Design a protein around this ligand. Structure first.
Ligand SMILES: Nc1ncnc2c1ncn2[C@@H]1O[C@H](COP(=O)(O)OP(=O)(O)O)[C@@H](O)[C@H]1O
Ligand SMILES: [Mg+2]
Length: 753
């Protein structure tokens, strides 16, 4: 009799139906006789009879729906069980604290070779299943870790990598994380350790399914962050790790000081992540006035001083010499001093500019650290060469300085990524297991080119998810005559074409703008609207529900898979160009420093189209491998433990598409094998009476002899299909070792008598 009915903050609440009206149900909340509220008939769901129980796989629920799913993960979360299955898909709720021993070496060992369901749900079981599928099917595998910023994608990606390398190695793949995170992660409002780049990390295996090396693909490092941040945000961790942790010798050589002294850090938060202990390890001369007044930033994982130590240890472990370490730090410090170069108006009509006299020291330090001549640097930042050397206005000089800073830092990041790939190389491999960790769909009050690229990425991945989970899965069920109720989806090719089609897509129109004599963000935006007047996915910013005052040539709205996003198109042309102007390129290419020249070993390189090419290569890998999915869930917006915000979690469950596939998964068949392959594996061990049976009939005798329930599996036209929660039963049927095969044949022989 009790049901789940809507609740504004908990998502659902328990109640009893006490009346029915047109389109409504009257609900009495539990243990509150007399009190009532109305709910739409389709927003009321059956509840599990036992409200205290929890199940490891949501498919085991008597009534699987969005409400019972929410309650089951809630009960598990109150007991620190953050991992729950939906058949072979994993739900991971961020605990926001370290749960003791769940990632231990002992826990890792306990998951090795274990079937899904034989051990409690865990990221390790997903990793082991990808490994087992890889080895048995001789097919490379992808593990996709999805969810909102702060949901736990990066942490779960590292758990998979640690599990695989520790279990199936003979390490560097794991130790390369502090390095990438130092240069590509930053404090944002939603995540103190936010990934500002996307990654696909492959672990390569030889014929014996032993680790031989790895390969990291990196995407869309956020360049805007390099120069300015909001007051609650920080630049890349490296800057603060270096300021907090560098020895006095390095501090002096790099002319470092407290973060408030650098324009590239001082618009953001200048406080370090530290605790009572690590704060005493940070020297007084590193601490900003705001750090001395407000104290440290708190986090259970991040510690700028401790992380600096751990990163240097990781650099040593991966094979980076102290010379390369110092070369990386010199570039980082050079970028900081570059940001301190200021300009003032010059010329009777303020048509030009000069370096401010107070910027003298910053110019000297920058040029020394980057191996540049101070005059060439001064000239390149304050004039532009034309087909004549003409003065730059203050705003243009600020742009030239920032363009150089962003390019040098992005090239430094590309070098670090390439350097980690060079630390675990392999000549050949038989298969890989790849883990995808890329930011999901997002929107803010102001949406720029970075959001456009990430949301574009998510449209393409959402299509891959629909194709793998819905299209291909159901086509197999249908081809096999399984009679599974069809779950449909509306394809998003029109939204993808709008962004990426040759010539007419937004990316090609943007590149067209970058190649024009006088590039303009308004001319680009007008050309988008002028080319896609009929397109339902596109509209002017005046049609939004702040966007009322945005002009038609000042933005566009894209109706995405997860909602309409209004993009402000200012800086779109600038952000789309990955190349430095020739004057700045020449300057850095001609550095006296070999390391600097090696970073750089009409000037226009399309960011949009470079990303489209990278994403297509990633999609080629995903489409050619088996796929496993981890859905990370952020429990609240406060980074706090034991605070399950029901309505916020329900919203993620709905927006992720999880709720839409519940019936398909529960009524699905994730495990399958042909009657022919099963028959052929057992054949040599069969007596005449068994071999004479047609493959399908031997399979029936095998399953009946083992006591397999007619409910547990279903026979297709050519394959046997096993249901969720039957992974252990299917793996025992599939196990190929001679002793196991001979034993099951003896069981069938005995059963037949
Ligand atoms: N299973 C976990 N155990 C402990 N802390 C976790 C776990 N998952 C996430 N966290 C915490 O949440 C923070 C955000 O997680 P993260 O993986 O960086 O999110 P995402 O990459 O999805 O934005 C982490 O820095 C860490 O403090
Ligand atoms: Mg991340």
């Amino acid at each position: 009799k009790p049901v789940w009915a809507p609740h504004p903050t908990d998502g659902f609440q328990v109640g009893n139906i006490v009346d029915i009206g047109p389109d409504s149900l009257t609900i009495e909340p539990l243990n509150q006789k007399g009190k009532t509220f109305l709910a739409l008939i389709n927003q009321v769901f059956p509840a599990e009879e036992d409200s205290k129980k929890d199940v490891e796989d949501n498919c085991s629920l008597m009534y699987l729906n969005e409400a019972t799913l929410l309650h089951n993960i809630k009960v598990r979360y109150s007991k620190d069980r953050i991992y729950t299955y939906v058949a072979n898909i994993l739900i991971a709720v961020n605990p926001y604290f370290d749960i003791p021993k769940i990632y231990s070496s002992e826990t890792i060992k306990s998951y090795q070779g274990k079937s899904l369901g034989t051990m409690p749900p865990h990221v390790f079981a997903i990793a082991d299943k990808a490994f087992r599928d890889m080895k048995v099917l001789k097919l490379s595998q992808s593990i996709i870790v999805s969810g909102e910023s702060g949901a736990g994608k990066t942490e779960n990606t590292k758990f998979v990598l640690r599990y695989l390398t520790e279990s199936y190695g003979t390490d560097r793949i794991v130790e390369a994380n502090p390095l990438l995170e130092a240069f590509g992660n930053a404090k944002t409002v939603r995540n103190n350790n936010s990934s500002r780049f996307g990654k696909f990390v492959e672990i390569h295996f030889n014929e014996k399914s032993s680790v031989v090396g790895g390969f990291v693909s990196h995407y869309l490092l956020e360049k805007s962050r390099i120069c300015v941040q909001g007051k609650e945000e920080r630049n890349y961790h490296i800057f603060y790790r270096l300021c907090a942790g560098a020895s006095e010798d390095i501090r002096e050589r790099l002319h470092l000081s407290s973060p408030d002294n650098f324009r590239y850090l001082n618009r953001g938060c200048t406080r370090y992540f530290a605790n009572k202990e690590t704060d005493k390890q940070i020297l007084q001369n590193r601490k900003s006035p705001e750090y001395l007044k407000a104290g440290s930033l708190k986090d259970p994982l991040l510690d700028d001083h401790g992380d600096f130590i751990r990163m240097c240890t990781a650099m040593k472990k991966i094979g980076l010499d102290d010379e390369e370490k110092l070369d990386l730090f010199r570039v980082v410090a050079g970028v900081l001093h570059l940001g301190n170069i200021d300009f003032e108006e010059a010329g009777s009509t303020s048509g030009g500019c000069n370096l401010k006299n107070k910027s003298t020291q910053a110019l000297e330090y920058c040029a020394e650290l980057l191996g540049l001549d101070q005059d060439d640097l001064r000239v390149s930042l304050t004039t532009r060469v034309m087909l004549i050397k003409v003065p730059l206005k203050v705003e243009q000089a600020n742009n030239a300085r920032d363009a150089l800073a962003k390019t040098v830092y992005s090239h430094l990041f590309d070098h670090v990524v390439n350097r980690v790939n060079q630390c675990f190389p392999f000549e050949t491999s038989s298969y890989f297991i790849g883990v995808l960790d890329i930011a999901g769909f997002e929107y803010f009050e102001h949406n720029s080119f970075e959001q456009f690229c990430i949301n574009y990425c998510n449209e393409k991945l959402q299509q891959f998810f629909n194709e793998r989970i819905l299209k291909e899965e159901q086509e197999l069920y249908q081809k096999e005559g399984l009679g599974v109720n069809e779950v449909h989806y509306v394809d998003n090719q029109d939204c993808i074409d709008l962004i990426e089609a040759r010539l007419v897509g937004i990316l090609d129109i943007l590149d067209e703008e970058n190649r024009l004599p006088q590039p303009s963000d308004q001319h680009f935006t007008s050309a988008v609207h002028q080319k896609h007047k009929d397109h339902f996915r596109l509209s002017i910013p005046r049609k939004s529900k702040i966007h009322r005052n945005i002009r038609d040539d000042e933005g566009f709205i894209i109706r995405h898979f997860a909602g309409a996003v209004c993009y402000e198109t200012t800086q779109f042309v600038e952000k789309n160009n990955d190349a430095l102007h020739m004057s700045l390129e020449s300057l850095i290419c001609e550095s006296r420093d070999k390391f600097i020249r090696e970073l750089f070993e009409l000037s226009f390189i399309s960011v949009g189209n470079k990303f489209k090419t990278q994403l297509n290569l990633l999609l080629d890998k995903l489409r050619s491998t088996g796929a496993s999915f981890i859905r990370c869930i952020k429990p609240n917006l406060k980074m706090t433990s034991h605070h399950f915000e029901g309505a916020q979690i329900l919203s993620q469950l709905q927006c992720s598409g999880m709720v839409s596939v519940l019936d398909l998964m529960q009524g699905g068949f994730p495990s399958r094998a042909s009657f022919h392959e099963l028959y052929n594996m057992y054949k040599k061990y069969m007596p005449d009476k068994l071999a004479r049976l047609d493959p399908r009939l031997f399979c029936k005798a095998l399953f009946k002899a083992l006591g397999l329930n007619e409910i547990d599996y279903k026979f297709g036209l050519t394959k046997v299909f096993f249901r969720p929660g039957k992974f252990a039963e299917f793996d025992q049927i599939m196990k190929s070792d001679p002793d196991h095969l001979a034993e099951l044949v003896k069981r069938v022989n005995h059963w037949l008598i």
